[PDB]
Homo-oligomer: A and B are copies of this chain.
Amino acid sequence: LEAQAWALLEAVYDPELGLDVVNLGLIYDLVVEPPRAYVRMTLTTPGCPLHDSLGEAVRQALSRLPGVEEVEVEVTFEPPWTLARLSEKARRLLGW
């Protein structure tokens, strides 16, 4: 369930950097407890966008989990994100 949720989030890509939210280090917490799924995440820029497409795409991915009918996506800026949260793979891909 938690492994499946992680694999599903790896499909959610942040267009600005061209990497998935997981390798970008944007997912802060993930809990799956049918019929609910809970994910706490952040964005690379500290401000709420007019449309949280990324949060929406994360909601859609988790919904496709077995036994999940309720998906809660909490977008927070605590702690504030920095490039340090990238995975090594993400770094190699950005040339950082």
Contact = CB atoms under 8 A, between A and B. Distances in A.
A91 to B, nearest CB: 9
Interface in A47-95: 76, 78-85, 94-95
Nearest to A33: B16
Nearest to A3: B95
A27 B83 contact: yes
Question: Which among A25, A81, A83 has the highest number of chain B CB atoms within 10 Å?
Answer: A83
Interface of A: 2-4, 6-7, 16-17, 25, 27-31, 33, 38, 40, 44-46, 76, 78-85, 94-96
8 contacts: A2-B95, A2-B96, A7-B95, A16-B31, A27-B83, A29-B45, A31-B44, A79-B79
